[PDB]
Amino acid sequence: RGFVPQKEIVYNKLLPYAERLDAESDLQLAQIKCNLGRAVQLQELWPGGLFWTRKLSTYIRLYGRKFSKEDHVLFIK
Hints:
By secondary structure, the protein is mainly α. The protein is built from three helices and no strands.
């Protein structure tokens, strides 16, 4: 697809509804990029910056990484 995943969780492919998880997790990652890059630019650290930090964490509890090598570096930096 549009990007190369980088060590997903294997156990998401084995679900009965694994066709849906591709279109879902691409939307959630897009929202995390959008409203984390906005939130740091806005310096909305308590209700917004620490929110989408907490939602990026549960993106990795759920989906593994599933973001680019180019975009893994951006979250790290």
